[PDB]
């Protein structure tokens, strides 16, 4: 039998485990209405990624996507004083900066925002800082470059480092044949590349829109 | 907006992520019928705990439950060769020895089986083996003793170590107000203990029947 998560149970889950920092909760609550809040990682998704950072013993983290700045904050909160998180915001629509909350939580010095198309920001990061830089990489950028991002992330990650990729099941459109959009076309393609990939350890969690955890061997 | 794991989707999930060793597959096929297979941790969930053992950089692993020997094998596989995995089988009912399979893969020398009540086996390893011996502990034993197993776990796990608890939502029974059973009752009690536990870092995954992951400090 498969676990059907209901609103009442999700409420319970959150209650017994969500240990959210005020600036986070505030950043979240102040952007709930915002349409951007949807592309935003879930409270426990982020707390899980914090666990991951501790288990990685990460010093440098990288993320990509259209952000409110919530996942970037949570990430540095789980990072040590000397650590650093590079958030890449590809969003070119409406936003509000997250730095006020970052300051309030004492993280703006650990968070390095990089605006613009994720692809460019990642090659720049390669050029500048070399290949094995990040102990933890999170991918939630535009789906139609997911193949490029995966490959790049493989060059940017630490041997013991980890990579997380969101929306593996594009809402169940990766199992829907009548969907013709290039976004669900790229996800399906990437899921195949990984399946047949001999280069990494792998595990997929049915928690978000599906989250893939890959680690080089 | 919550992910309902559809059978068709669970197939896709397994299809793209599953990398189950030849011996494990075999083990699951025969123990499949036994209906002790319902207590056996699912394929994807075990590949996850393997990822956890690798992240953890573990050499010592502990399991509690009514096993078929599958998760003990999966764990042992993820461990190096100087690695140890101690599985505790509280099973009373019918069963079949898993060593024919632990031998197929050369894991025979890494798995130390321990039959009998879990409280005694945990106190035994505790009462002398020291503390902080295991880098990863997995609790899935009798529900009514869950509050206890938790306390022992915190003692036996190493710092930077990890404890995974299964059946955290007990099939939605954790919400039911008309539930008296000491099983769901003891689970609920535990979740509250974890909820207010300042000794650890927490994280609750909506996979399986819910999986809490707590770590020291």
Domains of chain A, first to last: 1-217 (3.40.50.150)
Q: What is the enclosing helix (H) or strand (E) of A190?
A: helix A182-195
Q: Which residues of chain B make contact with A192, given a CB cutoff of 8 A?
A: 16
* B201 DSSP assignment: B
Which technique was used to obtain these atomic coordinates?
X-ray
SS3 A37: helix
Q: Residue A82 corresponds to which tokens in the numbers above?
A: 């000397």
C-alpha span between B75 and A69 (Å, rounded)? 37
Q: Which of A3, A6, A17 sits opposite B203 (nearest CB)?
A: A17
Do residues A109 and A85 touch, judged by C-beta distance below 8 A?
no
b or e along A171-199 (b: 16 or more beta carbons within 10 Å of the residue's beta carbon)? Answer: ebbbbeeeeeeeebbbbbebbeebeeeee
Q: Is B161 exposed, middle or buried (0-12, 13-18, 19+ CB in 10 A)?
A: buried
Instruction: Scan for tokens 């902080």, then name that residue.
Output: B132
Measure A125 CA to nearest chain B CA, in Å.
25
Q: Do A3 and B5 touch (CB under 8 A)?
A: yes
> Measured between alpha carbons, how far is B62 from B111 in angstroms, rounded to an integer?
10
Kind plus residue range of the DSSP H or E element containing A63? strand A60-65
8 A C-beta contact, residue B42 and residue B92? no
Give dist(CA A136, CA A154) in Å, integer.
11
Q: How many residues does chain B have?
A: 217
Q: What is the resolution of this structure in A?
A: 2.7
Kindly report the backbone phi and psi dihedral angles of residue A91, in degrees, each rounded to the nearest multiple of 5, phi listed first.
-50, 125
Distance CA B85, CA B76 (A): 6
Q: What is the token pair recorded at B77?
A: 């596989």
Contact B144, B167 (CB under 8 A): no
> For residue B66, what is the DSSP state?
-
3-state secondary structure of A84: strand
Q: Which residue of B has its CA nearest to A135?
A: B55
Integer CA distances (angstroms), A71 to A23, A39, A137, in order: 12, 11, 12
Nearest CA in chain A to B193: A16
The phi and psi torsions of A200 (rounded to 5 degrees) equal -145, 160
Q: Which residues of B2-26 are buried (b: 16+ CB within 10 A; e: fewer)?
A: ebebeeebeebbeebbeebbebbee
């Amino acid at each position: 039998k498969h676990l059907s998560l209901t609103p009442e149970l999700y409420k319970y889950l959150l209650d017994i485990s969500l240990r959210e920092h005020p600036a986070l909760a505030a950043l979240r609550k102040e952007t709930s209405t915002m349409e951007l809040a949807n592309m935003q990682v879930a409270p426990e998704q982020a707390q899980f990624m914090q666990m991951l950072i501790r288990l990685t013993r990460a010093k440098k983290v990288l993320e990509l996507g259209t952000f409110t700045g919530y996942s970037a904050l949570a990430m540095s909160l789980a990072l040590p004083d000397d650590g650093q998180v590079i958030t890449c915001d590809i969003n070119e629509g409406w936003t509000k900066h997250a730095h006020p909350y970052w300051r309030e939580a004492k993280q703006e010095h650990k968070i390095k925002l990089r605006l613009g198309p994720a692809l460019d920001t990642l090659h720049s990061l390669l050029n500048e800082g070399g290949e094995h830089q990040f102990d933890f990489i999170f991918i939630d950028a535009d789906k139609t470059n997911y193949l490029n991002y995966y490959e790049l992330a493989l060059k940017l990650v630490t041997p013991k480092g980890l990579i997380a990729i969101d929306n593996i099941f594009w809402d169940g459109k990766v199992i829907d044949p009548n969907d013709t959009s290039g976004q669900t076309r790229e996800i399906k393609k990437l899921n195949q590349v990984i399946k047949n990939d001999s280069r990494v350890f792998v595990s997929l969690l049915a928690i978000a829109d599906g989250m893939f955890l890959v680690q080089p061997i």
